[PDB]
Amino acid sequence: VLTNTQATLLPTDLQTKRTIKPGLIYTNSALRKFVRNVNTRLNLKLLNSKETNLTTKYKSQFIYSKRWKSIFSKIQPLQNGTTRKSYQLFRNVAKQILVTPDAKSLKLITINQKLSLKERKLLELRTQYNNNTLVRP
Amino acid sequence: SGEVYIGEFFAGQRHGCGMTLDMKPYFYLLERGVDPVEAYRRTAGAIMKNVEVRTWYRGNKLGDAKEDEVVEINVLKDELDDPFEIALRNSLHDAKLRKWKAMSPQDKAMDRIVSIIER
Amino acid sequence: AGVSKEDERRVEGLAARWRRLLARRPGNPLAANDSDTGFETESDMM
């Protein structure tokens, strides 16, 4: 006995062959087991050399903060001698101490939004959902 | 102050669902010699527009630290893993139930002791 | 089980070099039944 909200979330029209004891817990357990089985089947099918047909390796995306980028763009360090001298001193000290060899540039790393891969992918998914599987809902 | 709160309380603090109204202008006009009907006519709309519905946890208002999106974000994070780990975890989930279904009470006690020691 | 170490190495390479290289415990933070709990971890939300 599924409510219409539960029924409309099933991907297709499925046939029931067993009589289950009445109650909400059994129905929820059946739905959870179905979701787990579908996810396991999808992952196993994908890992069985199915990525050969479709392989989309997208990575190396660098996210830069809008506020920090605008703030450091509005700063003019080279039109005046004193500002240039102060910027040179700070750049020397930062490159000596702050900048790691793995960083491309001090200016680039200054405005970079330091995000982990998982956070970046979650942000991409969230933006996709905002702008726009089988058993995700 | 005019604050009116209707809803759930736990211990001595707001905890659960609640509804908040700010009837300060109505009391302000009432205290200045205005009859209740005229004050209500003047200040009904503003009070009705500012009615708030909230969920409180231990006296704190939720909804500002992305409490609503926690479950969906965690589901997506679980879906972001590699296929082999997901498959092994899903198989282990059923294996644990199938093993526990047939164990003896002494075996169950020993298993729980081992789990506690590992934790 | 009929599983050689070569098969395990192949699967590990497929997972790591082909899939993992291609791109706090897992679970629902707000869960009623949690198997191993300890009854000490506190949820700061509902």
Partner: peptide
């Protein structure tokens, strides 16, 4: 039991591979 579950998953993967 954990090792047996892992080996069963490995066999399932190897079937296609």
């Amino acid at each position: 039991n954990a090792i047996l579950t892992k080996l069963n998953v490995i066999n399932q993967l190897t079937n296609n591979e």
